Amino acid sequence: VINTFDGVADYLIRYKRLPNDYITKSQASALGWVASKGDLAEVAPGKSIGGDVFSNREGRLPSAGSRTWREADINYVSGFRNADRLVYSSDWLIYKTTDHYATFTRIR
């Protein structure tokens, strides 16, 4: 399973998509995930949430003309979701956060 910061970042850069263990929130809900129940690993064994649009409401990440952002959960195994996320742009800037989008560090 590829779910680490470097592992997913390099996969994104090589393939321009997330590895096969990622599903979007709509897909997880279709499988029976309910936010707050912490049941993702029971309804979708070995899957992590990722691929949904990150809005960047707080302007913390660089904006550009026609640049949009997506997010993916990192280091997820089971139970309630953590605070680790990879946030990646349409032009392939890649940032990490370990505090649920409070702070960011550029890694690609």
CATH number of the domain that residue 17 is part of:
3.10.450.30
Q: Which of 13, 100, 105, 107 is catalytic?
A: 100
Tokens (6 digits) for 3: 């779910």
* Domains held by the chain: number: 1
Q: Which of 71, 84, 85, 95 is catalytic?
A: 71
For the purposes of burial, counting CB atoms within 10 Å of the CB of 101, is it exposed (0-12), middle (13-18) or buried (19 or more)? middle
Q: Is 100 a catalytic residue?
A: yes
Tokens (6 digits) for 70: 């997506």
Q: Is 71 a catalytic residue?
A: yes
Method: X-ray
Are residues 44 and 31 in contact, defined by beta-carbon separation less than 8 angstroms? yes
- N- to C-terminal Cα distance for the chain? 21
b (16+ CB within 10 A) / e for 14-53: eeeebbebbbbeeebeeeebeeeeebbeeebeebbbbbee
Residue 90: give the domain boundaries: 1-108
What resolution in angstroms does the PDB record give? Answer: 2.0
